[PDB]
Amino acid sequence: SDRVAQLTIGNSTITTQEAANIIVGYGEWPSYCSDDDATAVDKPTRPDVSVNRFYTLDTKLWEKSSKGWYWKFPDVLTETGVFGQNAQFHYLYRSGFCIHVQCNASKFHQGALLVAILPEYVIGTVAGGTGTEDSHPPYIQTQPGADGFELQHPYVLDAGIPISQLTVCPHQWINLRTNNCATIIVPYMNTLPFDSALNHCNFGLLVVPISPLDFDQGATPVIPITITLAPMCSEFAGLRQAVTQ
């Protein structure tokens, strides 16, 4: 009654029969902006079906020597579907997300992942190596899009913060002896109630193998990791022509 689930929203459902449990980030569901909070005076659009779908984005192969990946949300979906068309026309934006990452393996493979969220995941550099040149990260390390980006130094998460206490932020583990998926429901976290969808990326989805993959030779050596996400309770405002960046 906990191992088996089904998440239907929009026209797309996903079934899982070896889940762990759904955690709701910071204990509350995504919701619409109340009139106590809103400052924009134009009526928002709320598509309510066409953008609240599980978008399956990409597939990272996980071998025995991987480091970890990250996806900046919502810039994984400003190139995809009716979410990517409404977020490019409209200046303002708010939504929550239901984030579901699948990674199946046999009952002989082993290894654990820490799929975790963290809001305002800013990216530092190696500062020129020795630490004296103020190098800023490029635009693709900042906002990789639906392609994702691989961590260089996952012990410090490319930001000088340790991964050992990433477990404070909303997370759950995918260890291949127990579960194969990890649902994380995230509300809209930001100070101001709407923001731009092209500039500001509210959070980043860190997916790091902490305990590495291991399997005896003869088993299937290709163990993919696919993340599917669904913008919940999304609404846009401030209509103008299409910007792409």
Ligand X SMILES: *[C@@H]1O[C@H](CO)[C@@H](O[C@@H]2O[C@H](CO)[C@@H](O[C@@H]3O[C@H](CO[C@H]4O[C@H](CO[C@H]5O[C@H](CO)[C@@H](O)[C@H](O)[C@@H]5O[C@H]5O[C@H](CO)[C@@H](O)[C@H](O)[C@@H]5O)[C@@H](O)[C@H](O[C@H]5O[C@H](CO)[C@@H](O)[C@H](O)[C@@H]5O[C@H]5O[C@H](CO)[C@@H](O)[C@H](O)[C@@H]5O)[C@@H]4O)[C@@H](O)[C@H](O[C@H]4O[C@H](CO)[C@@H](O)[C@H](O)[C@@H]4O[C@H]4O[C@H](CO)[C@@H](O)[C@H](O)[C@@H]4O[C@H]4O[C@H](CO)[C@@H](O)[C@H](O)[C@@H]4O)[C@@H]3O)[C@H](O)[C@H]2NC(C)=O)[C@H](O)[C@H]1NC(C)=O
Nearer to ligand X, 131 or 218 (CB): 218
**239 in the Ramachandran plot: left (φ > 0), alpha (ψ -120 to 50) or beta?**
beta
Minimum distance from CB of 218 to ligand X (Å)? 13
Nearer to ligand X, 81 or 221 (CB): 221
Nearer to ligand X, 209 or 231 (CB): 209
Minimum distance from CB of 229 to ligand X (Å)? 23
How would you classify the pairing of strands 149-150 and 69-73? antiparallel
Nearer to ligand X, 217 or 244 (CB): 217
Distance from C-alpha of 68 to C-alpha of 222, rounded to nearest angstrom: 16
Which residue is at the shortest CB distance from ligand X?
A: 65
Q: Closest Cα partner for 104 from 23, 215, 22?
A: 215
CB 233 within 8 A of CB 30: yes
Minimum distance from CB of 212 to ligand X (Å)? 11
Minimum distance from CB of 157 to ligand X (Å)? 16
| Residue 213 backbone dihedrals phi, psi, to 5 degrees | -65, 145
* Tokens at 228, concatenated: 């599917």
| String marking each residue 53-82 x if it binds ligand X according to CB under 6 A | ----------x-xxx---------------
How would you classify the pairing of strands 23-24 and 181-186? parallel
Minimum distance from CB of 147 to ligand X (Å)? 15
Residues between 114 and 173 that touch ligand X (CB under 6 A): none
Q: How many residues bind ligand X (CB under 6 A)?
A: 4
Angle (nearest 5°) at CA 173 between 169 and 175: 165
CB 94 within 8 A of CB 193: yes
Nearer to ligand X, 46 or 67 (CB): 67
Q: Which residues bind ligand X (CB under 6 A)?
A: 63, 65-67
